[PDB]
Amino acid sequence: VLRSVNSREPSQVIFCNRSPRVVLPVWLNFDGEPQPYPTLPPGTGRRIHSYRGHLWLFRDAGTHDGLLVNQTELFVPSLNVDGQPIFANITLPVYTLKERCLQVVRSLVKPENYRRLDIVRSLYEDLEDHPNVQKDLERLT
């Protein structure tokens, strides 16, 4: 369901990273497969030659946390109206405090040491449920 359309109709896009995270732009190819592109440091942007119908999602390059582009999950550019480029504003979602806490613990604790933490059993399953493109793609459908 979720793939790029092979249009070959060029479309200039501005990726702009307005998050404190390093962004991994992920291009979904013609078979729905994720093909990551060079990262964007926080506060930086890049013009890119993309195409009409091409579908992109944006992840934290170090944790695979989902990010937002134009206040949503996916980005598909239209044809440039009078050559003007199409803007992709990447931002942090307002994560829940519990998801933000899971992110921080995951960044400090190796996955094999989750079960050594003095927390409730249900929090082990939550730590081990790492954020992940394939998991999120099935839900988006």
Partner: protein, 104 residues
């Protein structure tokens, strides 16, 4: 420009916002609405420095970049105690445990 604050006295902490253009007096009015003591019965502080009522929060050093929602600036509060103002006294919060070895 909104400034996010923690007005603290003893074991009381008020979380409240205000403009940079708002005055120290206007902040005392906030405190009176919650803790039922008038502005003349209050003394506001940035660190150990007593703030003047007619100064704007911005003039006191409270900016948006330094008084954020996720990291609010602290304004110390001292109430009147009989013939004198009580000493500014903010009771510190609890301490986190020692960082586990599985994290460090």
């Amino acid at each position: 420009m909104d400034v996010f604050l923690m007005i603290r006295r003893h074991k009381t902490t008020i979380f409240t916002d205000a403009k940079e253009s708002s005055t120290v007096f206007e902040l005392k009015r906030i405190v009176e609405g919650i803790l039922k003591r008038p502005p003349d019965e209050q003394r506001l502080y940035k660190d150990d420095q007593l703030l003047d009522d007619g100064k704007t929060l911005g003039e006191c050093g409270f900016t948006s970049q330094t008084a954020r929602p996720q990291a609010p600036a602290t304004v110390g509060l001292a109430f009147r105690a009989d013939d004198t103002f009580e000493a500014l006294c903010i009771e510190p919060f609890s301490s986190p445990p020692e960082l586990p070895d599985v994290m460090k």
